[PDB]
Design a protein around this ligand. Structure first.
Ligand SMILES: CC(C)C[C@H]1CCOCCP(=O)([O-])N[C@@H](CC(C)C)C(=O)N1
Ligand SMILES: [Ca+2]
Ligand SMILES: [Ca+2]
Ligand SMILES: [Ca+2]
Ligand SMILES: [Ca+2]
Ligand SMILES: [Zn+2]
Length: 316
């Protein structure tokens, strides 16, 4: 749409009020012209045909409950765009300011979110297992990071490369959650998962085994479900990433933490410069070491922590 840039206000899935960037042209649309070539949010009106209709509102106030998921998907995508640009100097997912699009209210009772190769899609949840998925900033950033990975390393979605792909999405979704300082943690999806139960989450990076995902290479899943366990085995990389950042002793191997910022610089460089579509865990380790080496010196502590972390999860 062509119109005047403005700012509206609404309430997100969790009931919090926020301002969002809109465009005015007869109606007010969820179209943010301030970032790259724009962020656009669409209503899929409970259908599965995408993208659906660009979200239009009559008065620039988004307090209706049907509005919530759109408010959050639109706002969280802007925060995520900000993280990448500010933190890594990357303009949108393709690095050339591509428009970011998301659709909400996809299908009925859909308990998932995904990147379909061209845009983000968020279900509303069935209200027991999940509430609308765009209310979790770590979920929004996990989705946009799949776009980043597809434009860069291109990790194929199966087996070890696919689990690397998935870990990348959880790691940067968590880093964006800390960037925005939105009650950050090392858990995934806590804010929209099982509304009835407090304290849980979908996956844990600090202790993946809490939910049954592997935290050591010897425990990897070798079957065929989930494309070869991309959502299970990512637990091994997530744990490594958490140790690089926070430090700890795991399986008797001690790691000194180097912090989130460095974790992000190292993984971003590995992703954008060294990983390839078919890279495996052992190649991710070489990539991460080389990146840390590039950035801090081969005799640095940084390099040392990256090695210890992988050794601790059993990746040689
Ligand atoms: C949400 C379900 C239980 C877990 C897996 C389902 C398969 O989803 C594939 C697409 P994705 O981008 O990996 N979606 C992720 C959504 C989370 C972060 C809420 C995911 O882990 N989905
Ligand atoms: Ca309105
Ligand atoms: Ca949190
Ligand atoms: Ca989280
Ligand atoms: Ca819960
Ligand atoms: Zn994913």
């Amino acid at each position: 749409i062509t119109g005047t840039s403005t700012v509206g206000v609404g309430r997100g899935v969790l009931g919090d009020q926020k301002n969002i960037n809109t465009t005015y042209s007869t109606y007010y649309y969820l179209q943010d012209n301030t970032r790259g070539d724009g962020i656009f949010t669409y209503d899929a009106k409970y259908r599965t045909t995408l993208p659906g209709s660009l979200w239009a509102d009559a008065d620039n106030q988004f307090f209706a409950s049907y509005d919530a998921p759109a408010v959050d998907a639109h706002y969280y995508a802007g925060v995520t765009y900000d993280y990448y640009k500010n933190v890594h100097n990357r303009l949108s997912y393709d690095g050339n300011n591509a428009a970011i699009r998301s659709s909400v209210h996809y299908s009925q009772g859909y308990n998932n979110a995904f990147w379909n190769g061209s845009e983000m899609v968020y279900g509303d949840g069935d209200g027991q297992t999940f509430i609308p998925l765009s209310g979790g900033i770590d979920v929004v950033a996990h989705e946009l990071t799949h776009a980043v990975t597809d434009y860069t390393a291109g990790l194929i979605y199966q087996n070890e490369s696919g689990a690397i792909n998935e870990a990348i999405s959880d790691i940067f979704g968590t880093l964006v959650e800390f960037y925005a300082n939105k009650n950050p943690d090392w858990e995934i999806g806590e804010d929209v998962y099982t509304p009835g139960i407090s304290g849980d989450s979908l996956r844990s990076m600090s202790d993946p085994a809490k939910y049954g995902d592997p935290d050591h290479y010897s425990k990897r899943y070798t079957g065929t479900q989930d494309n070869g366990g991309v959502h299970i085995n990512s637990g091994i990389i997530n744990k490594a990433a958490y140790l690089i950042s926070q430090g700890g002793t795991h399986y008797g191997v001690s790691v000194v933490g180097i912090g989130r910022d460095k974790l992000g610089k190292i993984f971003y460089r590995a992703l954008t410069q060294y990983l390839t579509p078919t890279s495996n865990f052992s190649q991710l380790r070489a990539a991460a070491v080389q990146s840390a080496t590039d950035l801090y010196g081969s005799t640095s502590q940084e390099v040392a922590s990256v090695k210890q972390a992988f050794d601790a999860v059993g990746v040689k």
